[PDB]
Structures are given as C-alpha cells and as structure tokens.
Amino acid sequence: EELLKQALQQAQQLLQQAQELAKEELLKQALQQAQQLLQQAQEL
Amino acid sequence: EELLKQALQQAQQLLQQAQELAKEELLKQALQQAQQLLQQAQEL
C-alpha cells in the first residue's frame, strides 16, 4: 500500500517528465515506464 | 500533440485522484482510466 504510494508517486513524476518532453525516445520511455508503475499500481 | 498534452494533463489529474484515494472501486477506476489516457498518449 505505501508501495502503491511509491508506485503512484513515481508514475506521477514520470508523466510529468513526459509532459515537459512534450512542451522523442525519452518521451516514449517515460510513458512506457509510467505504464509499468501503473500496472503495478493496478495489481497492487 | 496538444492532444498528447490533453491526454497527459488528464492522466496526471487522474493519478492524483488515485493517490488521494490511496491516502477501492474509485481507486480502481482512476487507474484504469489513467491507463487509457496513457495508451492514447503512447499511440499519439
């Protein structure tokens, strides 16, 4: 559960990296990685 | 691209709803929905 927290806080930090990249490879990566934390968040 | 922005800004608003729900059904929903915006973000 604090793990879900560690997963969400980091997915949040990563969607924010995606966002500033949006304003290529590193945007792709940041979204992939964030999806990961969210799948963990979902199963957690 | 501003669409990727609209997708990311909203996925961000949703991982934040998940987070406060974390501190059941609505946490599940918020993560599902956020994953959606991120898949759109990825394909976009």
What does this protein look like?
Chain A is mainly alpha-helical and 44 residues long. Chain A has one domain (1-44): Immunoglobulin FC, subunit C (Single alpha-helices involved in coiled-coils or other helix-helix interfaces), CATH 1.20.5.420. Chain A contains 2 helices and no strands. In chain A, α1 runs antiparallel to α2. The N and C termini of chain A lie close together (7 Å). It is classed as designed helical bundle.
| Rounded radius of gyration of chain A (Å) | 11 Å
Considering residues with a beta carbon less than 8 A from a beta carbon on another chain, report the largest interface and each chain's count: A-B, 22 and 22 residues
Number of domains of chain A: 1
- Count of helical regions of chain A: 2
Largest sheet of chain A: none
Between the first and last Cα atoms of chain A, what is the distance in angstroms? Answer: 7 Å
CATH C-level class of chain A is Mainly Alpha
Which secondary-structure class do the elements of chain A indicate? mainly alpha
Strand content of chain A: under 5%
Brief synopsis:
The first copy, chain A, has 44 residues and is mainly alpha-helical. The first copy, chain A, has helices at residues 2-22, 25-43.
